[PDB]
Amino acid sequence: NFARKVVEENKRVKDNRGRQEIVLFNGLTTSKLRNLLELINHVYTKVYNSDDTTLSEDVRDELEYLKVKFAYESGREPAVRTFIEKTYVDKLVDVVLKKNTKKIFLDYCKYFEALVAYAKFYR
Amino acid sequence: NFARKVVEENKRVLFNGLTTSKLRNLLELINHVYTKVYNSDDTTLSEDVRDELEYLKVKFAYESGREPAVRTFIEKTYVDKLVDVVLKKNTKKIFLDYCKYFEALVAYAKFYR
Amino acid sequence: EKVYQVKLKVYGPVHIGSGKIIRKQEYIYDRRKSLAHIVDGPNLVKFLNKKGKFTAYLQYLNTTKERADLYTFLRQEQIDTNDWKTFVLYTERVNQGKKGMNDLHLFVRDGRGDLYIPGSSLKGALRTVLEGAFHSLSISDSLPIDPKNLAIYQKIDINKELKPMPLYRECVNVGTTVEFTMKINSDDWTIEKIEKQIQQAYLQYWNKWFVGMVTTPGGKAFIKGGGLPSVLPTVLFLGGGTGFPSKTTHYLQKPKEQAQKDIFAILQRRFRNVYGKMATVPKNVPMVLDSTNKWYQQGVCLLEFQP
Amino acid sequence: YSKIRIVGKIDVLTGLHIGGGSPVVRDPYSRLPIIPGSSIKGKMRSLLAKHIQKMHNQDAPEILRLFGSSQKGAIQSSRLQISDAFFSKASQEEFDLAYTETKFENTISRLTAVANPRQIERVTRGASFDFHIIYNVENINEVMADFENIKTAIHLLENDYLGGGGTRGNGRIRFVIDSIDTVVGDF
RNA sequence: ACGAGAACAUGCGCGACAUUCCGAA
C-alpha cells in the first residue's frame, strides 16, 4: 500500500551510549499506540459481529470516542502527534464517517494495520 | 532450480532458523488467495484479488518484522518483489507461477530438514 | 478434593493494575468535595453532541492538551449536574494526602463492569511467599465488589517520614470482604502448613524489615495513626505499590544481616537512578514505605479459610 | 439401540479460555467464542479416569465403555458424543459489552524481578454456551451405571476448570441440564 | 455374407477408531 512511503518518512534511527535503537519516533512505544489499536480492535470486532454493509451508529459512537482518544494521544506525546500528522488518520476517520459503509471502514482499518505493520518491520 | 539454490545457500538450520509453524499463516493466506483465483476463470486478477494480494504483501511485511528467520526468508526468496511483479502484470498465469514457486520453496525447505 | 472458601478482608488500600491508565479526560473530579466519577467515552460524546458542545470540547482539548479535566470543562459550560449523573458510569470517593486528578491507574475489572481481583495475583503471591509445579493448588477469581466502596487512595512513600506522591492508584476501601473458592489435594499442599508458612513469612518480613521503620519517627507516626491493625495472623500484600520486600523468597532464603544486603543490591539493580546512587546499607532495606484520620498500609489483606 | 440427547447450558463463572492457534477459539462462521466438544470430552474423561498408563487407551473399563477405546482387538465404540458448545443466542442478546476481554499478567521473574507482560483473551463471566451430548444405548442393563459415571464426571467438571490456566482463575463453568429425552428408540 | 454373433469389469464396503491446545508464572 501507499503507507510504505509514509512509514519511511516517519522512520528514524536513534543512537545513545553505544546503543542503536531502530525506532521511528522516541515516543512511538508499542503500548502508547496499542491503546488506540485496541480501541479500533473493539470497533472492528463489533463490525465483524454485526455483519452489516453500513457503519453502525454505535460503531460511530465508539469511533467518535476513537477521535477523542486520537486527540488525547496527540496531547500526551509530541511523537504520536507528529505520527498522526504524517499519516492524517483524522482524514481517514472522517471519510469512514461520511461514506458510512463497511467496505470503506475495512479498507481504512487495513490501511492503519499496514501503517503499524510497516512501523514494526522498520524497527 | 532457483528455490533449490536459495534453500541450499540458506542451509547450514534453514533461513536463520525458519520452521513451518512460522510460515503457516503466510501459507494459509497464499493458498486461500490461490483457491479464490482457481475458482474464477479469468486471465486477469480481479479487484478483490488484487486487494487480497496487497493484504498478503502487508502480511509478508508484518511477518518479516515479527521474526528474523521469516525476514531473511523474505529477503532471500524475493517473495514480496514477486508479489509486486504479479500485481504489475495482473496475469493469472504469473500468479500461478508464483504460487508454484512458493510451494517448491516450502517443499525444498522441508526436504533439507 | 479439598475445597476451601477463602475470605479476603482488605484492611488496607489495594490496587491491582488493569494494564491501562487514564488522565483527567475519562472521569470528572469534583475538587470542592473531592469525588471522582468514572465515565465512559461514548456516552460523554453522545451527551455533548446532544447539547451541541462536542466541538467546544474538541477546542478545549486542543487548548489544554496536557491537562484537560472533564469536571473543569463541565463547570465552564455550566450544564446541569443531573446530566452529569445521567451520563456517568459510576461515582467513587477520593482520598489525597496533600491537588487535582492527573494520572489514574484503573483497578482490574471484568468485562461486564463489576470490579474484582484475579486469582492469578493470588497464585503468584502465594508462590512467592511459600518459597524461602503448583498445579494441584488451583485458585479461582474473586466475587464482585460493590462499586460504591471502590475509591482512589493516595500512594504515600515513607522515607523515615511520610510524603504523599502525585501518582494515584485506584485502591479498594477498607472493610470490604471478597470471596474465593480454592481446590487443593492433601497429598501435595496442606492448608495448615501453607497458612502457617504465610504467617511465619509475614512475621519475619515484619521483624527484619518493618522494625527499622518502627524505630524511625515515620514508622512511629504510622503506628500512632493506626496503619497496622491489632490483628496484624495471616497477612498478604496483593496489590501494587506495596513494595519489593513484601513476600520475598530471597528475604526468607538468606539469613538476617545478609539478606538485607542482597535485597539492597537487587534494589540498586532495579532502580539505578534512585538506589544505584545509594551504596551504604541502612538499618532497613529498602528505606521506602483515607479521609478518616485512621491510617492504613498499601495492600494489607487478612486471610480467612473455611474448608 | 437408543439415542438419548442431553441438551443444556454451560455458563462460565470465570474467564473461559481455549487457546486456539493469546487468542481464544472462535467459530469462523459466527466469529463468536466456542467451547470445543473435544475439550469438554477430554476434561471429563481425564477427571473420571482420575476418580476411577502410558498408552492412554488402558484407563478403566468404564472409561473405554463411555468415551470409546481404540484398543487392538478390543475396539469399543464411544457411547458418549460431546459436540461443540456454541455461544448462546440469549447470552449474545444479553451482552448486546464485548464477548471476550483481554487480561494482563505481568509474569515477574524471581531472581531479577523483571516483568514480562502478557495478554490472554478470555470470555467474560456470565456468558453461556448451549451444549449438546448424545448417549448411545449399546447395552440396556449398563445404562444406569453409565449415567451415574456421567453425573460424577459432570460434578468433577463443575469443581474443576475447563481449558486455559485454571489454577489462576480460568475456565470455571457451571452446568444447567434442560432435558434428557430418548430422541431415538423406545428407551 | 468381417474368427463372427450376444456379453456393464461389475455386486458389498464410513478414511474410520483413542486423543483437554494443556503445565508454568
Task: Describe this protein's structure.
The PDB classes it as rna binding protein. Keywords: Type III-A CRISPR-Cas RNA-guided nuclease Endoribonuclease cyclic oligoadenylate synthetase HD nuclease, RNA binding protein. The entry is titled "CryoEM structure of Enterococcus italicus Csm-crRNA complex bound to AMPNPP". Chains A, B are CRISPR system Cms protein Csm2. The organism of A, B is Enterococcus italicus DSM 15952. Gene of A, B: csm2, HMPREF9088_1946. Chain A is mainly α and 123 residues long. Chain A has six helices and two strands. Chain A has helices at residues 3-10, 30-50, 57-76, 78-87, 89-99, 102-122; strands at 14-16, 19-21. In chain A, strands 1-2 form a two-stranded antiparallel sheet. In chain A, α2 runs antiparallel to α3 and α5 packs antiparallel against α6. The two termini of chain A are 18 Å apart. Chain C has 307 residues and is α+β, with helices and mostly antiparallel strands. Chain C has helices at 41-50, 54-63, 70-77, 81-87, 119-130, 191-215, 217-225, 249-253, 259-270; strands spanning 2-9, 17-23, 27-30, 35-38, 90-94, 103-107, 138-139, 151-158, 162-169, 177-184, 235-237, 300-306. In chain C, the strands form two sheets. In chain C, strands 2-6-9-8-5-4-3 form a seven-stranded mixed sheet. In chain C, strands 7-10-1-12-11 form a five-stranded antiparallel sheet. In chain C, α6 (191-215) crosses α7. The termini of chain C are close together. With 187 residues, chain D is α+β, with helices and mostly antiparallel strands. Chain D is 25% helix and 29% strand. In chain D, strands 1, 4, 5, 8 and 9 form a five-stranded antiparallel sheet that branches. In chain D, β2 (69-71) and β3 (74-76) form a beta hairpin. In chain D, α1 crosses α4 (143-159). Chain D is globular, with a radius of gyration of 19 Å. Chains in contact: A-B, A-C, A-D, C-D. The interface between C and D is medium-sized, with 30 and 31 residues.
Q: Multimeric state of these chains?
A: part of a larger assembly
First-last Cα distance of chain D: 9 Å
Helical percentage of chain A: over 70%
- Shape descriptor of chain D reads globular
By DSSP (H or I, 4+ residues per run), the number of helices of chain A equals 6
Kindly estimate the percentage of residues of chain D that lie in beta strands according to DSSP: 25-35%
Given the structure, what is the number of helices of chain D?
4
H/E topology pattern of chain D: EHHEEEEHEEEHE
Structure classification of chain D: alpha+beta
> Percent range for helical residues of chain D?
10-25%
Q: How many strand units of chain A?
A: 2
Compute the CA-based radius of gyration of chain A: 15 Å
Query: Tally of extended strands of chain D?
Result: 9
Radius of gyration of chain D: 19 Å
The main pleated sheet of chain A reads as: 2 strands, antiparallel
Most extensive interface between two protein chains, with residue counts? C-D, 30 and 31 residues
SSE order of chain A: HEEHHHHH
Backbone structural class of chain A:
mainly alpha
Identify the strand order in the major beta sheet of chain A: 1-2
Shape of chain A: elongated
GO molecular function (chain A): RNA binding
Pfam families (chain A): Csm2_III-A
Organism (chain A): Enterococcus italicus (strain DSM 15952 / CCUG 50447 / LMG 22039 / TP 1.5)
Keywords (chain A): Antiviral defense, RNA-binding
